[PDB]
Structures are given as structure tokens and as C-alpha cells.
Design a protein around this ligand. Structure first.
Ligand SMILES: [Zn+2]
Ligand SMILES: [Zn+2]
Lengths: 49, 258, 231, 116, 148, 392, 213
């Protein structure tokens, strides 16, 4: 068998707004959850409302 | 080639057969290993003929191989001179037998004074790769070319006289120069570096000029002799060959600013 | 190109669930000595198992793929020499619509699936807009046009002009074309002029013009003066 | 070259020289399973490889639409309906000798007129 | 040779057998015992448990306020039972492992004395492997022997 | 025309039959490749050679069919715009579209496009465009032509991007090099690159391609031209050439001078045989003698059948006195005069070749004022062809 | 077989040695260099057929013109070696022999290689020098090639005259490396200016001046 061709257009995937906003909204959502939990730990640790 | 042996194909075939690298693997169709404990007698019914002839304490393991007759033709070889080469390679530790050219099947067998198989397999690598049957190193695919050569006639004007000239793939200038059967006073290399090393600085200069001039004439353009001469000279005025780089004139004094 | 689109991705679970109902042996039960001629099944590169009858299974998946059950964006390839059957339903693939050619017809030779009646109903709905609700989706669900990416394009034979390469058999001003020795035409090109992009589509008679001039004009077409909108 | 495996151990059988009876044997170094030798051959390298040119021949090769069609008859069944394709062994020095595959008896007859 | 743009007017102007019953065993026996499957990996065809001899034994071998990650149920119950069982005598060894994928749909048709059959749903399935046939090993001796 | 279109169709058709025959002989394994290449390389060279031969022949037929009333023929014959390849691709056939110097490779499984069969080695499917730009192109040909166009653009872009870097390395490589007021090329630090600029001391704005009459011609022509005998009848002097030809014959001194000139020309011929071993006589040199001779003949009204008033000592001693007037170096030491003679040897050989007694008395028929004017023009133009010191 | 070929290579190499010594300025006649192969085999080969390189060692005497131009130029002693690997003791015999015979220069030709201790024991007797050349390297004379112009070793007075007429320092001349097979062919030293006469295609005869490193 010949060496696997990488220039075959079928083996290539395009990215529109869907995948890009999926990565972006994914990371931003993770940061949001982490920050919310940080506020929770600060609240229960500092003993406040 | 030499002017005396010009326009000759057989002589150029001898020169090609004297410099073109050849190896034992080139001629080898296949090889196979056999267990044959008795040194003289062979279980194989065919090779018995060889056993009958080439005979008239040693390893029980047999190494055997077969050669392409076409390879024995295209690259002129003799089963005899091959066996000579191996015998003078490993000397006496490896006993050797080889079939005749008359045999429709070319056969070669060898033995030695843990398991013997691994030892044989090592020797197989040495046989295929490390044996060169003929020719000097780094020479391949010698092409015969009929090149017309302008030479003066005794009638006062030049005449084109075709002669066989050997084009060569790969390079090894020093070894090729010493071989008898060619002009040692004529030879060229597309790599001007080798010309510099072997034939010295002046030859390196002229060769460099030829290399530059070649690309110019290939482009289909004309450039005056003055400019190319100046360029070539600059690259050679400190001895040897000097690169045109930022490591080729910024590593020698010219003023810190320059 | 003018008819090229990008896939969006579907769900491979219903397909994997549907394969095991027809005897698709799982991978962990595979023995190469008991079933050497089994065809491996691949779903998005994941090897789920093999099957000892890829013909009827492939025909079933194709018939159910043309009826509109499976999303047409999914591209399935069946490599014979490699003895594989790749299934791609991931987002990012670029496909293009092409017609479907059938060999079994009442005329005795091969012919397209779409006929003149479907064209008559289609144009009736187009010029009517009484209506018959016959659009592109109705042409797709009846198995008359199919999307093909660059992976499935490896295992299909496409014809350029319909009425020039499908039927079986000259003025010197026309161009010389190929022959129709090939019989196994599976698909047919809608129109070759669709291979060009938007900028090259403005070029008049680009066949009679050299390519770099088509490129230069395609570059100058992105900066000419005009009217972009009315507002 | 076409070696056997051990019983229970299923490991490869390394060759063992029998110095007592002076004969080849096949052993398993994990256990004490040693069987006799039915052949003195052990290793064959075979440098110039000619196999693999006709690789990937399947029973369903006649239903491939991408493959061409020819009108040459088979030397066996004399069927002019066949499918031809070149060698499957991909290499620089691979010849372009066609391989005829009849669509009746599934015989593979080539088109080489020099060597058959 | 010209673009036909008057298609609106053209379209406007043109348009022997043996029957045996099946039964479901009462769920009391299913609540008492769980049915698992056995599959050997020694290639030998026979290998019955009678030839496995006796006695056959199959047995299983300060910080402030912080953060936890999470986990679910069935996966946790299968993760806590990470001790595989073994069957031996007092010598042959068989050590089994989970199969997981071969759960799905597996119904047992146990044949009794009569022609009827008793169907039992399979809980799990395990692959038993004959262990310690040759009897050898080394650890650090093999780590130093592999450095040659 | 019609018949020309049919001749092009048959020309391409014969090449198609040749590619089909070589294709069948290659599929039958009946063709052995030559040394250095394999079967596929020789086959592709044969197919490409036949296709380019048919395209060139069709282009020749399309070029011959056109008349002189066509404007493209007037533009091609004018040398402004247009060429033979343009009308060969527009009127006859485009040709073979090659990528990276090779045929259209298989972008798919054993085929170039998914519109052909597998293992197809026909020239049409491998990239041959048998249609012309007058009748349009097919899609499978327009695609390959687009590949060739994009490849041309990319290649030109890379050649320019590297050409700039090469240009900067050459400019910054050769910068502080000039010629001082001593006719010696040396840089700013005093390192001597060339003792004489261009190894001759001549600017590149006054050099013209000249022909060497010393090596040109056969031995019988050499002895027939450069031998003017006075006491022998082999190469005697025609007395009707000059006015005093009846008194020149029988002179021993002028015959000795002719012997010295002839021996000098023979030594110059051996020297040119050792310098130029290729046999070419055309080399760039300063001072155009032919224009000076023609200006002298058209200035002094020198026509044929006119006896000249020159003698042998006037031409011989005139050339010998002109050879000392050629000066490039203004020194007087040993090495300076050695470099001057070694830098003027070739030009002196050219002047001794073009300024022979037979060539002036027989062909040119120059007089006294015409010959002296030619000498003054040669010395003058030689003094103007000197490179100026201080030029970069 | 191999013996006759080795005799031929040793004969061409010996002819190259005579040509090299003759180019240095020593008195060797033309008929002495143009000696055929059959005479060389009839002189320096035993009855068995093997050549004797110990008998091929000879002495070179400078010409009258070389003494007139270079008054400090002395005689030369040329020796070979029958050993494949030249030991240190043979080199000691060569150096001590040169010191006894009182030669200004010396040339020693080896077959394969020499021990590093011998190469270190070369600059031991100033101002005398020893030139170590290989038998396989002197098979072909490099000066008979077309791409190699003519080289002439100048003197001290001509060097000072050149630098005085051209107004140059020794560093301003084009430098040539000692490792040049041409510099080793002529046996050049530090501070020696050589003249290169080359046949240009724009002037016929171009001259150059180089100086060793
Ligand atoms: Zn075992
Ligand atoms: Zn058949």
C-alpha cells in the first residue's frame, strides 16, 4: 500500500461558527462554573451570607 | 575517454565494468538456510550434482543462495570470481561452494567451522550489504553518450568527431581518477567542491566559473565575462571557497559598521 | 463552488443500533479463523464488528438512505480491495448534490431516476408561485438526487452531460468530447458550470480563456464599483 | 518460514539441533514440548518479491462498477465477459502486465505473451 | 444561442417434530442466586470441571472547605468489585475477568429431565484464563535481564 | 480552413494510434526500457513525446495555413507581441497539460478523475487537451489547465521571493569594490581581487563581437591570403593592385618583412589554437575595424579598379608603429610592461590579422590618407575603450 | 594479475615523482622521465617479479639555473618504503640518514599510512623539511590537467620587487593554503610568492600572484 495521502479533501474537516462557538462557549462555561464554585468556597469558608 | 580509444563501445563497456559499483545483493534472487549435519553429504536431491563435482569438523548448518542469471549478464560476473571474493573476504572460517554457469539454477552454499542459525543470519547481512563484487564506491548508472567533439583537422578547420563519453550518477573523483583506461588529464565534476579538494585552488576557481556560467546559459541569457570573473575571483581571494552568506563576509574584518 | 455545502453532523447511535439487528457480529466475538471473509464495519473510525453479508446490508442501508430515513449528509464508503466500509457522519465534510443513475429500466439500458413528470410538477410549483408542494426536498425523499462528499467520490462513477454519455450510439466547430464505453455510471453531474465559484461565474465563456486570466478576473471582481444594497 | 506453535503454550517453536541422533527438532523454550522435523528448511529471505501483485481478489470482484470491462475470452470457459486490472503490488519496478479475471469460473489469466 | 428569458409565457401557455413448553422460574431463585457465564482461554477443547479434580474452589482474591468531583451508580458498584475470583484445587489455576460487552441479551435454556426448558436471564459473563501453566517469573530479574 | 482542420485531426489521430500501440505493447510486456529509467518512465516519455510532436506538427500546419492578411501573422513577423506557440494553441491544439513536469497523477483510486475508469493510461484521461481555445475546452481538460495555471502562479511567486533574497545577498556581497587610479580592482581595505578590471581593462559599454581572421579559414586559404611572395611564383603579388607593383616585385627586403609578418601570424594562429580549443572565432573585443574601413572607403571615395599608392613597408611598419601606441597602463617598469603586453596580445593579434598587406592592397585598396586615418581611428577608439578609474 | 597492476601503478607514480622533482628545479633529463615500463621492471624488479622500492630511492641535484636563481637551494634525497604501515623506526632511519648526508630537504613516500609519532618527528631538524606523500596520491600528476594553469615559484628579490611596484603588504595578496596539492607539489613554505600563468578567454595570457599562508 502507498503512503497515506494527506491532501485528500475528504480527510479534511471545515469549521464554521458552530464548532468555534462550541469550543469558545465550552471554555467560557467551564470558567464560569469554576468561578461560581470559587464564590461558594469563599462564602462557606469566610462564613457569610 | 582517451583520444586513442574513441568511438568505441566495447572499451567504454570495460571502463563501465571497472568503475560501476556492484554488490552481491544485486545478483541475489533469494537465499535459504538448511540443516544438513553431515558436511559432505547433502539431503537435497538436486544439489547432489554439485556435491558430485565441487568436492572431488564443520558446522551442521548450511547457508545457501541463488543468483539471477540476468544479473550475472547485465553485471558481468563469474560464479568463480564471486566465490573468490567471499573466500578472500571471510578467509578460511567459512567454507564455500558455488554452482557452474552451465547450471540452469545458480547455487551457492557455505558453512562454518548456541544455535548456528543466528550466526548464519549475521553472515547473511554481511554477504548482501558488505560485499562489493566490482567497481569503486559511490558510482551508479553509468550512461553511454555519443558527444561530438570539435577537434582540428589537418585541413586547417575544426571537425566534429563523435566519441563515447561516460555520464555518471553519484560522485567519487579521487578513486575514478586513478583507474587505468581513461584520461587522467581530463575529467569534470558538477560538484566544484571536490574539484577544489583534489585538483587545488585554481581548478576550484575555473570550475566555479563554469558552474555559474552554466546556469546563465541555461536561462537563455548573456552576461559579460567581466562581471562573472569578478564574482568568481572574490569568492577565491582568501584561499579555498568562501560562502556568500552572513557567515561568509561578516566573519572577516571590514569595519564593525560594514 | 456554487453548490458545495458543509455537513453539520448527526447521531451515529441509531445506525449502530440498526446494524446489530441484521446479524452484525460484535468485535469481541470475532475469530479470523472461523470467519476470514467477514467484512469489517466502521462507524466514524470505530470498529464495532464485522458482517458476513455486506451486499444485502449495503443495499439495505442505501435504500434506507435514499428514502430520507438517514440524514443525506452521512457519507458511506465501501472499499472493496481494502475490505472495509467506512461511515462518516461527523461535521465538517464538504459535499455536493448529484443525480442518481439506474441501470434496470424498462427501455433496456441505463437511465436517470428523475423523469419528465417530476420536472413538470416541479416547474408547475415554481411558476405557480394551484400548488403541488413539489420542491427540492420532495426530489430528495423520492430517491432522485444524493449528496456526495470527497470520500464517497472515490467509489462512484460520475457522468458529465446526461444526454451525451448515458445513451448508446459532427460539425467541426464544436469541441471534441470523450466516448461512452463506460457502462457502470452510478451518478451524473448536474451541470459542469457549477464547479466554478462565485467570482468565476461572472466570466463569459471561461472555457475559451486561459486559467490565469480567469484568476485575475476573479480577483478584480471583488473590488469593482456597483450597487451592493438598496438601503 | 511457515513455523508451528507449541501445544498449550502456543508459543513459536524455535529450531533445536539434535546432536544425539543428529537431526533437526522444534522446541518451545517455555516448556518441554519438542517435536520432530519434517523438513530441513528453516529460513527463507526471498529478496526479489513478486507476490502481492494479484492481491485483494474477492468473490464479489465482478460487481465492482469502478473496474473496467474487456471482450477477451477466457482460455478455460471461453467467456468474453471479464474484468481486468494490473498488479496490486505497488513498486517502482512493477510491470504493467494486465490481469484478466473471468466473470464465470473466477479464473485469473494474465495477458503476458512472453512468460505465462 | 441566447438566454431564453420568456419562459413565463411558454409555461403559462403550456400549463418428526417434538413440542416442549417453556416456563419462567419464580423470581425467588433469581433473588437467591445470580447467574454468570463461564468461558475458558486455554484452546484445549475438553477441560471439564470433573477433570479439574477436587476440591474445586472459586473465591475472590487539616484542610478547610474543599471540592469533590462526582460519579454515578452502576459504574461505582462495578468499580468497587475490582477483585477477580479464581478456581483452584489444593495444581490448576483459573482466573476470570469481566466481559461487560457480552451482557445485552443472553437467555439461558436450562434443560431438565423432561423435554421442557427453564429460561433464566444472564446477569453477567466472565472469561476464565488458565493461569500458571509453566510456573516461572522474576520482576527485577527480568528488568535487569532485559537491559542486555 | 477546413482541409487544415482535417489535417490537424488526422495528425492528432495518428499520434493517438501511436500511443495506443505503445500502450498495448506496454500492457503485453513486450517493451524493454533503456538504461537509466524504468518501463513507466520510458512509456511516459514516449507518450509525451508523441503528443508534443503532434501538437507541434498541428501548430506548424495551422501556421502555414494562415495568410499574410491576418493581423496576428503581421504581429508575429513584426516581433512585437505574439509567437508560434500562441497561434499553435489557439488555431491548432493546446497540447499536453503537465504538472511538475509529469503527467496528471491519480488523485483518486487508480484514476485522475471519478469520471473515467480505473487503470486508464489513455492520453486523453492523463491530461491531453485535444480541443482548442476557439471551440472551447471540456471540464476534465479545464480542470487540468487550472492546475497548470495555479502551478505557474505559485512557481512565479516562489521564483520572485527567492530572487529578492538572492538580489540582497549579491548587492551586499559586492559593494565596497571599485577600481582606483592604477587600473587595479581592489576593495576598500586594499585587498586586490583583480590586478586588471575584467582582465583587460575595458569597460562593458564599448565591447563588440568581433571575428578572428587568424584561426578562421583552411590552411590553403591561410597561405593563400597571408603570403605575398616577391621572388617566388607560388603566392606572387598582382602588380595591378598598386601603382608601383612593377618595382615591388624582386625586392628582398620587403619579402623578408613579409616573412616576419607571416611568421608572426602563424605564431598568433598557434597561440589562438592553444587559447580557444572550441574552434569559435567570434569573441567580444573593443574597437570595430569594419566600420572604420567602410567609413574610410566611403569617405575617401575608394572604389574598385583603383591602384593604391601604398607599399609593403608602409603597411608593415604602419602596423608595427600602431602596436606600440596601444597603451592601457601608464607605467614603465618590467611588470607593468609585461602586464600591458599580456593584456594587449589578443588585440594586437586581431589588428595583425585584419591589417595584412594582401587584405589592404587587394580588397580594401586603401591609399595613404585613408590608411593613416584608419590607424588614427583605431588608436583613438582604443584610447576611448579604456575603462575609467573610479567606477563601481 | 594484481602484481602487474601494482607494478604499473608504482611506475606511473614513480614517473609522477620524477616529474614533480623536475618541476622543483632538480636536474633530471627528459629521457630519465620518459623511461618505459619494461625497463623499470627490468631494473627495479627481482627475478620473482616483486618490485624493490628500496632500490628506487635516489638522489636529486638542483640545476644550474635553480642555483643561480636560488643560491640557498640544496640537493634532495628521495626514498620510498616497502612496509605497508610505516613505523617510527623507519622514520628515525630516514631523519638520521638525512642529518648524516646533510640534505636541505627530504621526500618520503609511504604506501598506506604512517604512525602519528613519526609525523610528529618531522619538524625536528631546522631549517630542513620532510615531505610525506602517499603512493596512491602520486599516481596521477595534477599539473598535467587542463584546469590547472602554470605555477612558478618566485624568489625574495622578485617578491620585494613585486610588493614595491604594486605597493602591497604581504597580507594584501591573494592567499593560498599550504594544504593545496599544488603547494605540496611545489613544496611551498610560509612567505613564498608564486606566479600563476593562466590562459584567459579575454586577454589570452593572464598572470596572477599568490602567497602561502
Ligand atoms: Zn510450550
Ligand atoms: Zn473463465
Amino acid at each position: 500500500k502507498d503512503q497515506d495521502d494527506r491532501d485528500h479533501f475528504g480527510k479534511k474537516r471545515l469549521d464554521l461558527a458552530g464548532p468555534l462557538l462550541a469550543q469558545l462557549f465550552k471554555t467560557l462555561f467551564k470558567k464560569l462554573t469554576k468561578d461560581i464554585f470559587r464564590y461558594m468556597q469563599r462564602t462557606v469558608e469566610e462564613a457569610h451570607d | 575517454l582517451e583520444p586513442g580509444h574513441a568511438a568505441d563501445q566495447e572499451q567504454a563497456k570495460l571502463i563501465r565494468s571497472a568503475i560501476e559499483h556492484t554488490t552481491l545483493k544485486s545478483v541475489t534472487i533469494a537465499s535459504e538456510i538448511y540443516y544438513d549435519p553431515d558436511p559432505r553429504s547433502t539431503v537435497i536431491p538436486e544439489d547432489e550434482e554439485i556435491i558430485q563435482l565441487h568436492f572431488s569438523q564443520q558446522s551442521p548448518w548450511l547457508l545457501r543462495l541463488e543468483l539471477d542469471r540476468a544479473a550475472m549478464n547485465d553485471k558481468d560476473l563469474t560464479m568463480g570470481q564471486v566465490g573468490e571474493r567471499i573466500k578472500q573476504t571471510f578467509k578460511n572460517d567459512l567454507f564455500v561452494i558455488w554452482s557452474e554457469d552451465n547450471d540452469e539454477k545458480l547455487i551457492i552454499r557455505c558453512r562454518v567451522v548456541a544455535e548456528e542459525d543466528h550466526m548464519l543470519k549475521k553472515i547473511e547481512n554481511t554477504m548482501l550489504e558488505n560485499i562489493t563484487l566490482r567497481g569503486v564506491e559511490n558510482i551508479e548508472r553509468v550512461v553511454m553518450m555519443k558527444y561530438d567533439r570539435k577537434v582540428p583537422s589537418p585541413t586547417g578547420e575544426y571537425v566534429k568527431e563523435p566519441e563515447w563519453v561516460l555520464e555518471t550518477d553519484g560522485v567519487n573523483l579521487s578513486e575514478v581518477m586513478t583507474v587505468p583506461g581513461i584520461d587522467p588529464t581530463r575529467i569534470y565534476t558538477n560538484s566544484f567542491i571536490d574539484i577544489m579538494e583534489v585538483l587545488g585552488i585554481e581548478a576550484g576557481r575555473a570550475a566555479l566559473y563554469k558552474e555559474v556560467y552554466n546556469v546563465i546559459a541555461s536561462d537563455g541569457s548573456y552576461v559579460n565575462y567581466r562581471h562573472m570573473a569578478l564574482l568568481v575571483d572574490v569568492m577565491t581571494t582568501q584561499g579555498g571557497l568562501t560562502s556568500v552568506t552572513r557567515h561568509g563576509f561578516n566573519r572577516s574584518n571590514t569595519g564593525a559598521l560594514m | 463552488s456554487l453548490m458545495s455545502c458543509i455537513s453539520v453532523g448527526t447521531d451515529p447511535m441509531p445506525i449502530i443500533t440498526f446494524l446489530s439487528e441484521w446479524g452484525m457480529e460484535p468485535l469481541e466475538d470475532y475469530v479470523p479463523h472461523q470467519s476470514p471473509d467477514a467484512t469489517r464495519v466502521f462507524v466514524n473510525g470505530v470498529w464495532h464488528g464485522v458482517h458476513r453479508n455486506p451486499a444485502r446490508l449495503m443495499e439495505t442501508l442505501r435504500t434506507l438512505r435514499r428514502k430520507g430515513d438517514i440524514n443525506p449528509e452521512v457519507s458511506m464508503i465501501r472499499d472493496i480491495r481494502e475490505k472495509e466500509l467506512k461511515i462518516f457522519t461527523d461535521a465538517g465534510r464538504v459535499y455536493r448534490p448529484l443525480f442518481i443513475v439506474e441501470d434496470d429500466e424498462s427501455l433496456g439500458h441505463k437511465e436517470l431516476k428523475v423523469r419528465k413528470g417530476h420536472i413538470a410538477k416541479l416547474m408547475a410549483t415554481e411558476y405557480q408561485d394551484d400548488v403541488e408542494e413539489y420542491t427540492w426536498s420532495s426530489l430528495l425523499n423520492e430517491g432522485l438526487v444524493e449528496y456526495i462528499d470527497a470520500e464517497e467520490e472515490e467509489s462512484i462513477l460520475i457522468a458529465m452531460q446526461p444526454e451525451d454519455l448515458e445513451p448508446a450510439e459532427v460539425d467541426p466547430a464544436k469541441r471534441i468530447r470523450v466516448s461512452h464505453h463506460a457502462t457502470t455510471f452510478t451518478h451524473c453531474e448536474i451541470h459542469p458550470s457549477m464547479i466554478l465559484g462565485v467570482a468565476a461565474s461572472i466570466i463569459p465563456f471561461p472555457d475559451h480563456n486561459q486559467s490565469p486570466r480567469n484568476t485575475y478576473q476573479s480577483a478584480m471582481g471583488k473590488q469593482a464599483m456597483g450597487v451592493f444594497l438598496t438601503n | 518460514t511457515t513455523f508451528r506453535f507449541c501445544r498449550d503454550c502456543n508459543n513459536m517453536l524455535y529450531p533445536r539441533e539434535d546432536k544425539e541422533n543428529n537431526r533437526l527438532l522444534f522446541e518451545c523454550r517455555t516448556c518441554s514440548y519438542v517435536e520432530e522435523a519434517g523438513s530441513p528448511l528453516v529460513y527463507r529471505h526471498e529478496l526479489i518479491t513478486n507476490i502481492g501483485e494479484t492481491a485483494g481478489v474477492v468473490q464479489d470482484i465482478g460487481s465492482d462498477p469502478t473496474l473496467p470491462r474487456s471482450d477477451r475470452e477466457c482460455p478455460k470457459c471461453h467467456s468474453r465477459e471479464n474484468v481486468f486490472f494490473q498488479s496490486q503490488q505497488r513498486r517502482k519496478d512493477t510491470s504493467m502486465v494486465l490481469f484478466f479475471v473471468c466473470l464465470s469460473c473466477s479464473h485469473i489469466f494474465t495477458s503476458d505473451q512472453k512468460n505465462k | 444561442f441566447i438566454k431564453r428569458d420568456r419562459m413565463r409565457r411558454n409555461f403559462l401557455r403550456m400549463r418428526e417434530y417434538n413440542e416442549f413448553p417453556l416456563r419462567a422460574i419464580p423470581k425467588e431463585d433469581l433473588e437467591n442466586m445470580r447467574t454468570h457465564l463461564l468461558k475458558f482461554q486455554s484452546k484445549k477443547k475438553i477441560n471439564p470441571v470433573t477433570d479439574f479434580h477436587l476440591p474445586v474452589r472459586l473465591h475472590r482474591k487539616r484542610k478547610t472547605r474543599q471540592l469533590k468531583v462526582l460519579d454515578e451508580n452502576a459504574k461505582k458498584l462495578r468499580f468497587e468489585e475490582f477483585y477477580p475470583w479464581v478456581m483452584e484445587d489444593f495444581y490448576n489455576t483459573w482466573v476470570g475477568s469481566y466481559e461487560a460487552g457480552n451482557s445485552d441479551s443472553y437467555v439461558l435454556l436450562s434443560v431438565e429431565d423432561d423435554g421442557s426448558f427453564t429460561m433464566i436471564p444472564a446477569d453477567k459473563v466472565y472469561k476464565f484464563t488458565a493461569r500458571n501453566k509453566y510456573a516461572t517469573x522474576x520482576x527485577x530479574x527480568x528488568x535487569x535481564x532485559x537491559x542486555x | 480552413d477546413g482541409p487544415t482542420m482535417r489535417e490537424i485531426t488526422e495528425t492528432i489521430a495518428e499520434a493517438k494510434k501511436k500511443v495506443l500501440d505503445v500502450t498495448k505493447e506496454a500492457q503485453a510486456n513486450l517493451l524493454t526500457a533503456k538504461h537509466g529509467m524504468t518501463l513507466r518512465e520510458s512509456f511516459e516519455d514516449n507518450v509525451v513525446r508523441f503528443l508534443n510532436e503532434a501538437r507541434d506538427k498541428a501548430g506548424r500546419l495551422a501556421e502555414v495555413n494562415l495568410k499574410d492578411l491576418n493581423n496576428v501573422k503581421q504581429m508575429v513577423m513584426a516581433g512585437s507581441k505574439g509567437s508560434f506557440i500562441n497561434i499553435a494553441q489557439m488555431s491548432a491544439c493546446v497540447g499536453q497539460q503537465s504538472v511538475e513536469g509529469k503527467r496528471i497523477a491519480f488523485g483518486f483510486v487508480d484514476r485522475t478523475l471519478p469520471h473515467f475508469s480505473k487503470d486508464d493510461y489513455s492520453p486523453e484521461s492523463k491530461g491531453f487537451v485535444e480541443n482548442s481555445y476557439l471551440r472551447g475546452l471540456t471540464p476534465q481538460e479545464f480542470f487540468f489547465h487550472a492546475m497548470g495555471g495555479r502551478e505557474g502562479l505559485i512557481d512565479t511567486a516562489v521564483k520572485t521571493a527567492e530572487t529578492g533574497y538572492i538580489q540582497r545577498r549579491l548587492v551586499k556581497a559586492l559593494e565596497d569594490i571599485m577600481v582606483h587610479y592604477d587600473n587595479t580592482t581592489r576593495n576598500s581595505l586594499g585587498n586586490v581581487i583583480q590586478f586588471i578590471y575584467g582582465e583587460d581593462g575595458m569597460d562593458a559599454a564599448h565591447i563588440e563581437k568581433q571575428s578572428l581572421d587568424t584561426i578562421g579559414g583552411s590552411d590553403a586559404a591561410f597561405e593563400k591570403r597571408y603570403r605575398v611572395d616577391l621572388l617566388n611564383t607560388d603566392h606572387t603579388l598582382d602588380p595591378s593592385l598598386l601603382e608601383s607593383g612593377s618595382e615591388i616585385l624582386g625586392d628582398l627586403k620587403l619579402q623578408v618583412l613579409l616573412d616576419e609578418e607571416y611568421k608572426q601570424l602563424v605564431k598568433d594562429r598557434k597561440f589562438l589554437r592553444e587559447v580557444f580549443v572550441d574552434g569559435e572565432a567570434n569573441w567580444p573585443l573593443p574597437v570595430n575595424i569594419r566600420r572604420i574601413i567602410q567609413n574610410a572607403q566611403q569617405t575617401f571615395h575608394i572604389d574598385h579598379t583603383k591602384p593604391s599608392d601604398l607599399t609593403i613597408k608602409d603597411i608593415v611598419l604602419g602596423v608595427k608603429d600602431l602596436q606600440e601606441n596601444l597603451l592601457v597602463l601608464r607605467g614603465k617598469n618590467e611588470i607593468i610592461q609585461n602586464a600591458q603586453r599580456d593584456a594587449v596580445t589578443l588585440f594586437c593579434c586581431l589588428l595583425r590579422s585584419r591589417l595584412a598587406t594582401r587584405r589592404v592592397l587587394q580588397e580594401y585598396r586603401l591609399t595613404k590618407q585613408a590608411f593613416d586615418w584608419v590607424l588614427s581611428n583605431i588608436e583613438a577608439q582604443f584610447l576611448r575603450s579604456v575603462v575609467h578609474p573610479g567606477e563601481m | 594479475q594484481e602484481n602487474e597492476r601494482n607494478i604499473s601503478r608504482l611506475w606511473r607514480a614513480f614517473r609522477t615523482v620524477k616529474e614533480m622533482v623536475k618541476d622543483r628545479g632538480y636536474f633530471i633529463t627528459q629521457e630519465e622521465v620518459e623511461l618505459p615500463l619494461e625497463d623499470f621492471k627490468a631494473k627495479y624488479c627481482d627475478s620473482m617479479g616483486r618490485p624493490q622500492r628500496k632500490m628506487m630511492s635516489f638522489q636529486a641535484n638542483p640545476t644550474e639555473e635553480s642555483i643561480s636563481k636560488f643560491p640557498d637551494m640544496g640537493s634532495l634525497w628521495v626514498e620510498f618504503c616497502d612496509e605497508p604501515s610505516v613505523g617510527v623506526k623507519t622514520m628515525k632511519t630516514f631523519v638520521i640518514h638525512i642529518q648524516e648526508k646533510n640534505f636541505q630537504t627530504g621526500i618520503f613516500v609511504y604506501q598506506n599510512n604512517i604512525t602519528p609519532s613519526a609525523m610528529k618527528l618531522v619538524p625536528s631538524i631546522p631549517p630542513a623539511t620532510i615531505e610525506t606523500f602517499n603512493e596512491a596520491a602520486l599516481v596521477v600528476n595534477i599539473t598535467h590537467h587542463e584546469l590547472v594553469p602554470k605555477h612558478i615559484r618566485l624568489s625574495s628579490d622578485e617578491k620585494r620587487e613585486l610588493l614595491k611596484r604594486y605597493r602591497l603588504k604581504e597580507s594584501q595578496l591573494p592567499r593560498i593554503q599550504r594544504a593545496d596539492p599544488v603547494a605540496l607539489y611545489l613544496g611551498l613554505k610560509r612567505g613564498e610568492v608564486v606566479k600563476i600563468i593562466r590562459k584567459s578567454e579575454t586577454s589570452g595570457r593572464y598572470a596572477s600572484y599568490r602567497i602561502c599562508m
